[PDB]
Symmetry: D3
Subunit: 310 residues, 6 copies
Amino acid sequence: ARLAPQAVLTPPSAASLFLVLVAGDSDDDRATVCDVISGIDGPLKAVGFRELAGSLSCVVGVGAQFWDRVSASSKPAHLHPFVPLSGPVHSAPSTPGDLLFHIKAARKDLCFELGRQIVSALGSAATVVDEVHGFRYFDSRDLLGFVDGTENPTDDDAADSALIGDEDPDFRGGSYVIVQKYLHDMSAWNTLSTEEQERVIGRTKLENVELDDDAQPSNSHVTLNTIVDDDGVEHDILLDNMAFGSLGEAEYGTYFIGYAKDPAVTELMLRRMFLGEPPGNYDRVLDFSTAATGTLFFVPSRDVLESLGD
Amino acid sequence: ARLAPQAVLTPPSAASLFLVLVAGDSDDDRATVCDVISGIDGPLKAVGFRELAGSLSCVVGVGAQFWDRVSASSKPAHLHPFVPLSGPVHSAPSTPGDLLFHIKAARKDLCFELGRQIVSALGSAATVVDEVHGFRYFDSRDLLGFVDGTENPTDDDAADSALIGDEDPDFRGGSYVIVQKYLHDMSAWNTLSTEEQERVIGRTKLENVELDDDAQPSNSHVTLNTIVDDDGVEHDILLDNMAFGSLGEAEYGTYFIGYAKDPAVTELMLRRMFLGEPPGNYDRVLDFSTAATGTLFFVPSRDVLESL
Amino acid sequence: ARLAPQAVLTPPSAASLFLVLVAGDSDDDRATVCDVISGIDGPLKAVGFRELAGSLSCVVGVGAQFWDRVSASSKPAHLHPFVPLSGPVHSAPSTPGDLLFHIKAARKDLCFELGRQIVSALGSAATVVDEVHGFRYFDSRDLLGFVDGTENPTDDDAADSALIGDEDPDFRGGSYVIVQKYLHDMSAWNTLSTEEQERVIGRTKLENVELDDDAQPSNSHVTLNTIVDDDGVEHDILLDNMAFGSLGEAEYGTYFIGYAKDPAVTELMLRRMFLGEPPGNYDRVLDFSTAATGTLFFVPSRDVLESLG
Amino acid sequence: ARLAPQAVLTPPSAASLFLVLVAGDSDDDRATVCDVISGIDGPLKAVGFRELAGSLSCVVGVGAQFWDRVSASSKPAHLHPFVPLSGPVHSAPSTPGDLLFHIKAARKDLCFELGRQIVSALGSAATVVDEVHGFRYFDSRDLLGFVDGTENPTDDDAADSALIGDEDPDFRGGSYVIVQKYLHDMSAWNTLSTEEQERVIGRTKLENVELDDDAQPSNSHVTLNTIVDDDGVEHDILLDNMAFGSLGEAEYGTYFIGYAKDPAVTELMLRRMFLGEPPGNYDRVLDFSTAATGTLFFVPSRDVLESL
Amino acid sequence: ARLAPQAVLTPPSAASLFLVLVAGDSDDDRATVCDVISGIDGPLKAVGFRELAGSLSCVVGVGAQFWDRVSASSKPAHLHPFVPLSGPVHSAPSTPGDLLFHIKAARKDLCFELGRQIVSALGSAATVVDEVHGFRYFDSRDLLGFVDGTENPTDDDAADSALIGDEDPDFRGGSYVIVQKYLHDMSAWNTLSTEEQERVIGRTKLENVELDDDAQPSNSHVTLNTIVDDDGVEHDILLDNMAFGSLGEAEYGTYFIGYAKDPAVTELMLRRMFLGEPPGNYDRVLDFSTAATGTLFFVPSRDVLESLGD
Amino acid sequence: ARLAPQAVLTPPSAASLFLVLVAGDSDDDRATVCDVISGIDGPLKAVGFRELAGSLSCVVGVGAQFWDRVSASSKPAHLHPFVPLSGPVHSAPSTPGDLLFHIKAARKDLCFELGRQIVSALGSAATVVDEVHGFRYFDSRDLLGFVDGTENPTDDDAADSALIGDEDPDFRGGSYVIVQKYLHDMSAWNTLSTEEQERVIGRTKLENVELDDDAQPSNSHVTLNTIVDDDGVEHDILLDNMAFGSLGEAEYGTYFIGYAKDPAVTELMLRRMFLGEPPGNYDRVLDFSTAATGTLFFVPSRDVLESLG
Ligand code: HEM
Ligand code: HEM
Ligand code: HEM
Ligand code: HEM
Ligand SMILES: [Cl-]
Ligand SMILES: [Cl-]
Ligand SMILES: [Cl-]
Ligand SMILES: [Cl-]
Ligand SMILES: [Cl-]
Ligand SMILES: [Cl-]
């Protein structure tokens, strides 16, 4: 899918930009926002076409509160604000955001330029509340040092997991995306042995091999994020996480971004992580990662995006 | 689409070759030409397989006259010669061409070698009437200094814009292509300010952002080439333009090549450019660009191409 | 088309690994084999994800006999062990193989690592009988010096040639693959003149242009491997051949690997090559190439593969 | 120069990291800092070897004050703190910095990982006071839209311009570097015409051709930064400038970083920019660019660095 | 040597531009020419710096007649016009040229742009008389289908062969370059068998292996271009030949460009090719290649180039 | 630094070929060997020129014994056959080799082709005794999973460490190279914990950071291979190690290849490794790595090489 908005299914990239903005109160602000996002293919090609490879992509997401301001009588079945979670020691807050731009490219400058053109076009109609510059870290590792993104669905399976189909045909081809900006405690993580780290995650560190059943803790990240229903059907999500950080402020981070045809799946994964299964048996990754943001957005198909609102 | 003839929807390339040929009078010349173009996947794979990336593509176009020589029993709905335009200031000539080979690859040698093999195979049966060696110029620019090709439809919109469908099912998967070789008057172009040039085109020069509606002149290139039907639906074409030139002859050029499921879209862009909308309000880009060729070809699907 | 097993239609790669294995007679062994191959997308992603480009692929093949050990019924319409051939001068041996792993990537390391993880996971349950490290040789050439793989089908023509369709619907999207590890007689080939070699293959050497119909020997590799049915319709296979070799053992090989929706096409090609058409008029490529292995496998669709057992 | 510390003459890179640090008061802080920087080839190889291409480089700079703390017995001839400038309209502040790490690589992760390892190794002994993540912007442009770095000396001229030689043989192979973090007023810049901007810079915008002598304003950036001695010999510096910014904070920046065997060349460029030549005739580029930092460091040769 | 004029020793490139121009009669034309070529590092960096790799190079050459117009009292020891040669069937003409720009890059656009800027700067002061767009053809082959450039000297040996040293220290670091634009007769070449072609050249076609002594004809291209003196010292030149052509005009070509510290070596090679050794035993490549141009230029070191004239 | 033989100082490559040969006792054989190796720049350019990047290199090594057959006097100051070692637990065998071809390139095909042309040109005059196909493994790692080659000297430090200088002026620009083909015990290595492996090597595994002085075992590979003379001056070698292996034979190797201007440094490292410092305190890398070959060669400068015989 070359230079087309809402290409949710793009392969991993060397660089990414995650921009979360809050729309202004007024009807003017609301219309400018609609004009920019509905014509997003403009900037996308304006920038992307300058690179022969055409690696630039941009996925627009819209929050529940803003959606109801521009499309009151027509709504995707599962659009609602991020559901906050409160475990005994770790919490997943719900933080503001009306707009997500999830930008990917083979180069930083491409992501920066598109972001620059998008922010410029929005002007005073919206305010950036979160901005993260993602980058590939060695052989697809996260800053905890583990290969990150492995078990992502691909092919037909990626389409099945991520994109709305017959269940909500008015919004077929859309998706739901949840973001959380995680910051790690590197000191504490480094006090663990590699083997203990492998138990937290559920895979070997260097070689990235899944631990067998008999050595795989019931609270391992992989175990808790494996969703099987009563029918025995596996439910998967599509992740585009990227490393980010700042040496001077001592921030080493993982940006979580997960797409699903039904946010119920992602929410369940989160419930199992923060609250545990069985209860209290929570994901130990959370001892070393703290979510600073939590926002859900609806990702409209192109046809629906181009219609807003107008 | 890997090494398949008539791959109309290929992305941009670093290099291209546009070859226009006129076929000979004789029944033998006609048969050779048909033998060569119907088996075009041979040379295509013979060279293209030699590159790991497999970037090589070749689209064959056939002119109206030549088609009538080989298939008088059925005709694509819109196949006719290129229509000349005579405007208030500028004109678009209709020039000869029975065959088009639109060749694209990541490297010159691939384009050149495919062209070599095609011309050798055709021998005395056809003559090259136009030959242009296209090349990418920095970040997708044309020699006027502007990013060129930006608003090309992509993906589904691209197939919808370019590929023949239910409206003419006998030639489903085919397309129509129009070529014009433009030469630029560079010194004249350079006497304009950047702002003047931006108003001629419709976009900012370095940053390639569309001018807002209220700074967009009604005769801007972008404005005249925006085709909107009465139900408000835009109609787009697929452009594969490349820079070319010769320093010794002071040629600095843009090869125009546009594909559409219905050439009337492209033709209307041309009329609106050359004659103006409203009439008189012609495309200033034509004050700095002169077409030395103008030819329309039908682009058969693989199936149809293979049966010729 | 990224990091999904049974991706038959992948484009040529710079590196290859061809692993052929026989399985243990044990029941523990059968089960292990099934766990490994049914969950093959695990290792494939474990390795492949580490490369940004995602060039790594792995096609799993299962031999006729081992297939019967894990699928009583059902069975694919044309699954059977490799038919050996005994021709006037040259012979195609049918050699053992229960499992094929056809691995391709842009790098050696990715191939080797994936293979290492597959071999480790199988442990004692299976044994390697043939291991070939394939590599791209200059501009897609084999060690005989000719461009190799040129006339391969592409796009929809490739899918139609290689993938089981409406005609065997329980196994739709599967394929049949035949391998033969050919070793070459270099010095004998070198005594031919370029023009003689061109007669043998059916195409010009440097330029890879197909010889004229009137200059085309009736026993040229190309003509022998051209299949046209009675209605005039051509039938093609998908080749993924790679060069391999060893300098000290003086081994110089082409690894043949061909996929079809029906091995009837491949087997006919092999007959025309080894027996000849007319009989005795065999493929001269065989005078300089000797097959050291010969094994047929069924390539299950992704769904079929994941369901064992 | 492959993975050697103090490789001053490296070509441009897709990515960079500029880290400025102030060292702590204590004798222990001083020893840790010295241990880290004297063994800098460890982290450098520890990360850099992991990339086949070996694009990773790291240059260490030491400020005047910190140097006096570690080597009071000998001093490079021109080491002093950065001199503040107060001009008619604009000023260049002198801001703190004991250590500079100028890191370049083909990839962000390499720069980041080296920076991570250096900061971890330094621990409580030093504090990061400035951190900028530089990136190439299209075809070597800065965020003002101009090709930036064009007239850098190369090869022998580069070593002659940047490396200390016979004039100070105790520190042969060393250099002097000045950094300034510039932030741009983009909306103001955009109210100029392209022609106006070209006159501010001294070169045409898209094509990066020097303006002829008679269209060159006497206060153009290029004009003011051309240093010619009384025998007519030009004196050049080596620039490694990179774009940077933050969309949320509306920061759009150019990190200035310039190397010279004698910082007085660079300093004179700065005075001619900030105060003007003649006085009052200051660099208009400063009407759109504001320096938030200004720091001078000495760049020791490997030998000297390793002995600290 | 990054983005520096007169880098004679550059490695092979995917693209090249050879421009040969004739300077105008007048003192004005003469000064403009001097101003452009002496400041050539300007355009070179103006263009080259826009490509991260920095693959662009430009070597300026100056003909004998023009040299004497701008530097009458100071002259490289061996600067003279191209010496024409007349064999019984094949001839090497001497054709005009005051200026050579030999431009190389990884991309066409870079070579084109620099050429464009050079021609623009020269204006009416000079006229292009030859222009060739060179391109790599597969694995460094020429259009005759043979690997071309193999036996080029590299390292110290390239410097020793190509660049003026102590023998003429006023011009140390300069070189002498000869160009000939050859057009091939592909029909005639294709009537030969591969083996006969291998005998013409002196190397195997596909594998590019030198034929052994006992199967190597005394008139093979390789034999005739092997220069050994009485002392037994081999003398080599540095070649940067490139394919070029035009399908419509049926031109398939090899552009010869050879650099040497003393053009005597190149001239001897040419004498042996066109006249034979022994006499009449000429280079059979010439049955299939016809020189349309022949011009010698002096290539000044940077310091000398920057001094002209002024 | 392009397509010139005896380019010792080349950077790491994606592919390697290590060819070790013994020469015939014949005089015809001696002469052929000399013609091939003295004119090695021929094949090197014949192959290397076909790649735009020019990544192909070839270093020719000549064993002590064969050297004596073609150079009566002169002789390099420190040329001698590989000194074998017999340590408390582990042993370094000294194995045959007259010729070493150390070939590196960005592609396999370039390596293989060059090697094929060298073997063909030598014909009966020599025989391959060891052939290793080296490859880059992920981010410059060996099969033990550690970054391998990190502390290699660079720039002038590399030239000074590896190239013969003023001290043996007839052979200035030459080098001495030692090879050992190590095979690993993977499953034994895998029973160690990451932290134990880190103790064995001397560096962190993922991040490749050198362990603190106070956490550094006195028998860690790093400490054992650190050479500091009596005046305090460090002495380094240049390593070009590559991974190799075979899945079916269960071979997982590191090919050691180290260049020094004086093999005294390399041999001391080898002693500290095999014998230990103090004695018995040997390199634990040796508990999981066994050398199957061991051979020293002189690397002549380009001038010296071209002058045989
Ligand atoms: C004659 C030389 C020409 C030059 C130098 C030129 C240049 C440009 C440029 C710079 C753009 C803006 C970037 C883009 O979206 O592609 C553009 C757009 C476009 N041009 Fe041209 N053009 C030329 C001829 C033509 C012709 C003959 C046609 C139609 C037959 C044409 C049709 C279009 C269309 C359809 C667009 C996109 C408009 C939109 O939907 O925004 N151009 N051209
Ligand atoms: C000794 C091992 C072999 C070598 C060296 C070899 C070589 C070649 C070459 C050089 C070509 C021409 C380029 C191309 O179109 O791919 C070719 C074509 C072909 N070969 Fe092979 N081949 C070998 C074995 C086989 C076998 C065993 C089969 C069938 C089982 C086979 C089937 C084909 C087919 C179907 C084509 C395409 C023919 C066409 O339609 O033009 N090859 N082979
Ligand atoms: C403040 C932000 C700056 C911007 C946006 C900027 C931009 C530019 C540009 C576009 C050029 C022309 C291309 C080139 O040759 O590099 C240039 C040239 C140059 N600049 Fe800057 N510059 C800045 C600051 C500085 C400073 C502070 C200095 C000196 C301390 C400086 C020294 C130079 C020099 C020496 C040249 C080359 C002049 C010549 O010899 O032709 N620049 N700059
Ligand atoms: C079993 C085969 C070997 C393996 C797997 C191995 C592995 C390693 C590793 C992982 C490193 C650390 C990264 C680096 O700096 O390169 C290293 C360093 C080193 N190794 Fe080896 N090595 C092997 C054999 C040898 C041998 C036989 C020698 C000497 C003859 C040797 C000498 C060195 C040296 C000199 C260093 C750099 C030490 C330093 O100064 O920090 N290695 N090796
Ligand atoms: Cl960004
Ligand atoms: Cl071409
Ligand atoms: Cl492998
Ligand atoms: Cl960074
Ligand atoms: Cl050009
Ligand atoms: Cl090899």
